[PDB]
Amino acid sequence: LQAKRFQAQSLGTTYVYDFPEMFRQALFKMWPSPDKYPKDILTYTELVLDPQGQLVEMNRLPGGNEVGMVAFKMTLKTLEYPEGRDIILISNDITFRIGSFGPGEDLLYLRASELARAEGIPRVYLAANSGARIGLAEEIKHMFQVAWVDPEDPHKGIKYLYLTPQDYTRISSLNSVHCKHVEEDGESRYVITDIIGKEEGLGVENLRGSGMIAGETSQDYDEIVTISMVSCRALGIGAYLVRLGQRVIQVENSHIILTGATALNKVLGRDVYTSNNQLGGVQIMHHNGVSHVTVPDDFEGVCTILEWLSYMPKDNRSPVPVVTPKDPIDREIEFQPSRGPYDPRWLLAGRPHPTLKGSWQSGFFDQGSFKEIMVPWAQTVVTGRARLGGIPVGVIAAETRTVELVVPADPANLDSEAKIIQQAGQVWFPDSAYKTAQAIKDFNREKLPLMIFANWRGFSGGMKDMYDQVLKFGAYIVDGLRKYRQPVLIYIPPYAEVRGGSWAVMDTSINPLCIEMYADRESRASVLEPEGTVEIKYQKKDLVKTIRRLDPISKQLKAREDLLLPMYHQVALHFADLHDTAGRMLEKGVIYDILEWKTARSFLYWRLRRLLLESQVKQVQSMLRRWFVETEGAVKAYLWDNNQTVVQWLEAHG
Amino acid sequence: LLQAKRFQAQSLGTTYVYDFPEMFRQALFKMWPSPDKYPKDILTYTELVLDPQGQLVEMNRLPGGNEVGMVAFKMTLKTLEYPEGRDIILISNDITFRIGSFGPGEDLLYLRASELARAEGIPRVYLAANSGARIGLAEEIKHMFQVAWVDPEDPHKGIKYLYLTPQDYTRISSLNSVHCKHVEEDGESRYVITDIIGKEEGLGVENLRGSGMIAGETSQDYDEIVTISMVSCRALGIGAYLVRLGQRVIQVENSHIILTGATALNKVLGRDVYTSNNQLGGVQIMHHNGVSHVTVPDDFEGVCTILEWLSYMPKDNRSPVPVVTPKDPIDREIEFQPSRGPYDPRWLLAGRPHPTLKGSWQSGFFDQGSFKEIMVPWAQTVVTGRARLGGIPVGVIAAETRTVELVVPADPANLDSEAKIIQQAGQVWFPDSAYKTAQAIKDFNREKLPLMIFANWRGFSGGMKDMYDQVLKFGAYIVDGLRKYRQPVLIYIPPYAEVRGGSWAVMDTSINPLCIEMYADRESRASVLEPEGTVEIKYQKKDLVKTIRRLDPISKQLKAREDLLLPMYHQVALHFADLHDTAGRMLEKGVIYDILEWKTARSFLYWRLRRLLLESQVKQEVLRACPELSHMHVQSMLRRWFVETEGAVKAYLWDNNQTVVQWLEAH
Ligand SMILES: CC(C)(C)OC(=O)NC[C@H]1CC[C@H](CNC(=O)c2cc(-c3ccc(CN)cc3)nc3ccccc23)CC1
Ligand SMILES: CC(C)(C)OC(=O)NC[C@H]1CC[C@H](CNC(=O)c2cc(-c3ccc(CN)cc3)nc3ccccc23)CC1
């Protein structure tokens, strides 16, 4: 017990059978107000496989593992689900054969993953592995013979390897070797054509059990909630498993590798790499978007899992867990967006008052609810989870400030150095387009609604960015949104803009059943900005036609026009901006309704509470409207355009 | 009379839209074998025009008479694959009508001809020669609006607001072209302009809802039907998006696929960085990154590339693959012999027109002249294309073994940038070639094509820069693409080729056992690690020393004998680890269907693919009436039906592919 408990702590990780006590303890932390802690906060049954190759809920004593993989079906008690929520907890045993994957490790991972898929409950995976198992025939190793090209003289080569007829006969019929009988020199010998071995998990068959678990993981992300935690290391198959599950928590001083540092130096020849953390540590994986969040220790990772889960429904057949809000809906929004650049997280989470202490300047979402993912990667777009009157939502927000990308130096070219790049705010770069698509896909498979705070000038059209695939990454936004199954609320806040190519990828017509567009009183939208519109449709000739109409002096002339030209151009710009308003967006029907920031929280809440209520009842629209008319009256029918009325009605009638 | 529009298109380096149908006709004559066996009405088409209710109607009319800068055609084409005819939808911009800009009607006519191709489940062909979303200003309000200056002496002080005189607010009806707040400044009535709407439709944000409409439709099209796009002259904004959402792109030389022009970007940067639109989205960029699958010198050569791509694709999303009678026999051996060292894998696929003599050809795996590659300059460690195996069209993916020389082109925005040469080791999946592979898998799956993988991978790139460039994300896209694969997948490791660890994992039969079939050659290899790797962890100096003591007569002083024997008994350990990596082991462990031989692999895999295709159609007819039956109820039915007709003496021949195909084709 303490021998395995030492081997794990010496490797910096948590011993596998101690993990459920980290879950029971973190549930106490997440729980609000003691004394009133619930009875049986954490209940579980260890998942083991029987000799029939089938899973069984049998409960034993810790340490008694015959395979280097441990799974548990658990029931957790949370503020979201106080009676309990179920998950499947798979984990690698870092003590047993150094966390390698053999047939028995692949099979348990598969059968527990298939059980979570059948129930539709979250699959939480704990990674600490050495990848697929490796093996040579040790029986054949201590018996095999060599036939040299010159028996003097090891140089010149080898003809083949053989077995003495006594030894070929001794290993039966056991099927461990394929041999061709040969009469050479004067002795009978069995040329080893193929080495098979009388053991499982020696080569090729460990890849079939790797493909098996990759395909299952691939499919789970599409039907259930998958979460992966990297502790110590994730190698080859272990690294691909975390990726296919998409939501990765990387502990500090851990690595997500495909091949090791020594292995890569051995192939390349020279000593390129220093460590495995270099190749796939936090500085690589938290920065390129493979890792969603970093944590100091395994305990903190256990907390981040439950934290993410608190935004997610119980299973794939249950709605989002809406909780009684502590922060009211009847409040205005203290924080006010500026015309110039600002941090979009203020717009979401609020901020401490700029001058006053210890005051808080409120934001769109409920205080303390805004939890961001993929923070260091593709900083021109903000991705995360939040709560709106207790409704957990997926959050996507454009960054308006110029950001800093630090491409690290390539240890492979000794003349390489870190490339520093500036990325302009309100722009979808190849990376930010990828991030926006990825968060769309991830939040859709969590069965979460989506909230986008829109502020985009367009996609980057520069040579490098076009070479780097912006066209391909922008197309993935259009499809992520088309495939969206829950409500999508698109909002342009005050002094924000959505221009040409950006609107086209998120418009109501891509998915009208989910997408709804809301524009602020002070927001803008058009094909080009006024400058672009002015240069094509409001040229110098028209500009001179305007002076010779409005200027009373313009009745010599060239002296008067050349003075007013930069002034009547400012006129043209202002004229063009008047065609880009929310007033025009409403007249044309491209948006649902014009919003006012201070009251946008309360409006969007009731509209969101409505849509989620309306969809559950459906799991047909005219049927819902007629049932309102039937119960409230044909005289009250005008209130069907009022969300609070309809919300309070749906919550009552049912 | 309309020859001026024809002259306006020639000067823009493109074809006039009403001349494209006659190019199709001519291209079908070129692609028709031996005259005069030319079929009656090789091309028959109708023009698709929108009615005033916004509905598509079939019209037989004279050219040059469209009142929207978009044109659509419902074409019936007589080809070798379908001699009685196949249907396509042809949509194209009209570069002479408001410079091919996308307005209200242009967007509705693209959406309606697309939905018709969706509803009919047939190919949708789009020819791009556009200018992106249409822009405009309210011209009426322009010659009438007033400026309220903050200091009118003195206009340099700025603008307070723009307004209307009481006179002009009345004149402007009942027209709803402006929105005003009534003001009393100084003493006279002024109607402040708050919002300019405009009389004419298709100015601002309504064009972007029309763009979102067609974007979402093309995105659906690609997933459901065959999508092909060609680029002539230019593809701007929404136009660039359309070609990409359709995925399969032919870019004509000298044309550009861009989001924003060089002039506008230079104004935005405040620096004269770009000199041409070609530096942004010309073939130098689009053909070198995968957005453009192929390039052609002119509009007629690309019209030929569409029909060429179509010759591998079924007539609709319901039909089977167009199987043509083979001119190149199935009964033949492959002449080209893969080497132990690197070779061009296009020699393994298409052969070569003979090394010594000249020669016609030294035969390859596929039928002569049938291999047609896509994405030639992009991610050169993987080869992607289409080909025919005894007249069966397939998607082709082959690992490249030669060390590829990648030229990273100079960034005119970056001052220290030069044309950089990077080395891409053969047999390795990099962030770019993993992406290229998953792109081909996903795209060929939507063509409803069987896939054939000629595998030779050492694994994925594990270096720091490559891990940072997303090799895990892209490698995972191979898993997701093969799992969702719907037609047979024939993976084969050629002679002297290898599949190691990480590379087998992404493509194993367990990902899609209903589709995936694994075959290995007698001279191929596979395992978790390369011999050198297996020997490094599992056959250490301790075991190496032990062997020296057991197999060396002299080793019975000691330390000196073994030190001069260690470099050689090490090579012996490599020989030992390599015999675990043979096809013999792969077959024993049940990881491969069978061990094949290079010479006879073409004959073998043809009858197995003919079998797989024939049986899948039987399985479909069966699971149409009773979708509760499985693949195995279908397997034993045909198996027992064969029993039981031919034997039971010939029962062992249910395992022979040619025999079952012969029984199938006949029965
Ligand atoms: C440069 C950064 C990194 C900021 O981003 C990009 O590379 N692209 C993002 C974005 C940039 C703005 C663009 C919208 N452009 C305009 O509204 C605009 C257009 C034209 C213009 C003129 C003629 C044509 C011909 N159709 C097109 C544009 N000229 C201008 C001059 C000054 C300021 C803005 C503009 C979207 C992409
Ligand atoms: C080769 C490059 C760096 C261009 O590509 C990669 O980044 N990844 C492909 C990679 C996949 C993993 C593989 C490591 N596997 C081994 O089996 C291995 C090979 C050799 C090895 C060394 C030298 C030679 C040349 N005589 C051949 C193999 N040495 C090792 C030492 C320790 C552990 C594993 C290995 C490497 C390829």
PDB file of N, CA and C in Angstrom, chain B residues 33 58 88-89 110 138 163 199 237 252 370 454 458 496 523 526 585 590 606 616 623 628 653 656:
ATOM      1  N   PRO B  33     -14.103   8.954 -76.510  1.00  0.00           N
ATOM      2  CA  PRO B  33     -13.223   8.039 -77.269  1.00  0.00           C
ATOM      3  C   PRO B  33     -13.667   7.728 -78.701  1.00  0.00           C
ATOM      4  N   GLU B  58     -37.295  26.653 -65.124  1.00  0.00           N
ATOM      5  CA  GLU B  58     -36.475  26.179 -66.239  1.00  0.00           C
ATOM      6  C   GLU B  58     -36.811  27.000 -67.468  1.00  0.00           C
ATOM      7  N   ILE B  88     -25.768  17.759 -63.725  1.00  0.00           N
ATOM      8  CA  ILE B  88     -25.045  18.735 -62.894  1.00  0.00           C
ATOM      9  C   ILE B  88     -25.850  20.035 -62.871  1.00  0.00           C
ATOM     10  N   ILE B  89     -25.507  20.917 -61.909  1.00  0.00           N
ATOM     11  CA  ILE B  89     -26.017  22.278 -61.750  1.00  0.00           C
ATOM     12  C   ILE B  89     -24.810  23.180 -61.964  1.00  0.00           C
ATOM     13  N   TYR B 110     -28.169  31.883 -56.425  1.00  0.00           N
ATOM     14  CA  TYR B 110     -27.101  30.930 -56.078  1.00  0.00           C
ATOM     15  C   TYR B 110     -27.708  29.916 -55.091  1.00  0.00           C
ATOM     16  N   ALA B 138     -27.117  55.990 -50.242  1.00  0.00           N
ATOM     17  CA  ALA B 138     -28.394  56.614 -50.588  1.00  0.00           C
ATOM     18  C   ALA B 138     -28.134  57.933 -51.361  1.00  0.00           C
ATOM     19  N   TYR B 163     -28.624  67.038 -41.232  1.00  0.00           N
ATOM     20  CA  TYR B 163     -30.077  67.222 -41.116  1.00  0.00           C
ATOM     21  C   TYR B 163     -30.810  67.442 -42.445  1.00  0.00           C
ATOM     22  N   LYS B 199     -33.715  54.036 -50.419  1.00  0.00           N
ATOM     23  CA  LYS B 199     -34.834  53.511 -51.222  1.00  0.00           C
ATOM     24  C   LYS B 199     -34.465  52.136 -51.775  1.00  0.00           C
ATOM     25  N   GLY B 237     -14.011  38.253 -50.946  1.00  0.00           N
ATOM     26  CA  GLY B 237     -14.820  38.126 -49.732  1.00  0.00           C
ATOM     27  C   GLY B 237     -15.675  36.878 -49.640  1.00  0.00           C
ATOM     28  N   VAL B 252      -7.566  29.071 -61.894  1.00  0.00           N
ATOM     29  CA  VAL B 252      -6.956  29.384 -63.202  1.00  0.00           C
ATOM     30  C   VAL B 252      -5.703  30.268 -62.907  1.00  0.00           C
ATOM     31  N   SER B 370      -4.651   6.635 -65.299  1.00  0.00           N
ATOM     32  CA  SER B 370      -5.801   6.887 -64.447  1.00  0.00           C
ATOM     33  C   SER B 370      -5.495   7.723 -63.209  1.00  0.00           C
ATOM     34  N   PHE B 454      -1.674   3.448 -49.267  1.00  0.00           N
ATOM     35  CA  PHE B 454      -0.391   2.814 -49.545  1.00  0.00           C
ATOM     36  C   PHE B 454       0.535   3.369 -48.467  1.00  0.00           C
ATOM     37  N   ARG B 458       6.727   6.129 -40.415  1.00  0.00           N
ATOM     38  CA  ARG B 458       7.559   5.818 -39.246  1.00  0.00           C
ATOM     39  C   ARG B 458       6.827   6.308 -37.986  1.00  0.00           C
ATOM     40  N   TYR B 496       9.052  -3.597 -48.515  1.00  0.00           N
ATOM     41  CA  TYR B 496      10.126  -2.784 -47.932  1.00  0.00           C
ATOM     42  C   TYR B 496       9.580  -1.572 -47.156  1.00  0.00           C
ATOM     43  N   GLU B 523       7.442  -8.428 -47.747  1.00  0.00           N
ATOM     44  CA  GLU B 523       8.673  -7.674 -47.450  1.00  0.00           C
ATOM     45  C   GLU B 523       8.428  -6.346 -46.638  1.00  0.00           C
ATOM     46  N   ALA B 526       5.981  -3.919 -39.375  1.00  0.00           N
ATOM     47  CA  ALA B 526       5.138  -3.187 -38.406  1.00  0.00           C
ATOM     48  C   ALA B 526       5.347  -3.634 -36.942  1.00  0.00           C
ATOM     49  N   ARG B 585       4.000 -12.311 -38.256  1.00  0.00           N
ATOM     50  CA  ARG B 585       3.478 -11.954 -36.922  1.00  0.00           C
ATOM     51  C   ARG B 585       2.114 -11.234 -37.025  1.00  0.00           C
ATOM     52  N   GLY B 590      -3.872 -11.569 -36.008  1.00  0.00           N
ATOM     53  CA  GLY B 590      -5.142 -11.229 -36.648  1.00  0.00           C
ATOM     54  C   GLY B 590      -5.277  -9.767 -36.998  1.00  0.00           C
ATOM     55  N   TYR B 606      -8.078  -5.969 -56.627  1.00  0.00           N
ATOM     56  CA  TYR B 606      -9.153  -5.657 -57.581  1.00  0.00           C
ATOM     57  C   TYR B 606     -10.386  -6.537 -57.319  1.00  0.00           C
ATOM     58  N   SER B 616     -21.779  -4.791 -50.623  1.00  0.00           N
ATOM     59  CA  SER B 616     -22.283  -3.631 -49.888  1.00  0.00           C
ATOM     60  C   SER B 616     -23.658  -3.204 -50.418  1.00  0.00           C
ATOM     61  N   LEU B 623     -30.894  -4.532 -45.820  1.00  0.00           N
ATOM     62  CA  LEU B 623     -31.214  -3.626 -44.708  1.00  0.00           C
ATOM     63  C   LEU B 623     -32.124  -2.436 -45.087  1.00  0.00           C
ATOM     64  N   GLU B 628     -32.970  -4.031 -39.110  1.00  0.00           N
ATOM     65  CA  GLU B 628     -32.634  -4.608 -37.814  1.00  0.00           C
ATOM     66  C   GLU B 628     -31.616  -5.742 -37.958  1.00  0.00           C
ATOM     67  N   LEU B 653     -14.090 -22.214 -51.815  1.00  0.00           N
ATOM     68  CA  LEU B 653     -13.963 -21.142 -52.801  1.00  0.00           C
ATOM     69  C   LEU B 653     -14.745 -19.871 -52.459  1.00  0.00           C
ATOM     70  N   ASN B 656     -12.165 -17.432 -52.047  1.00  0.00           N
ATOM     71  CA  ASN B 656     -11.524 -16.996 -53.304  1.00  0.00           C
ATOM     72  C   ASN B 656     -12.347 -15.813 -53.846  1.00  0.00           C
TER      73      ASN B 656
END
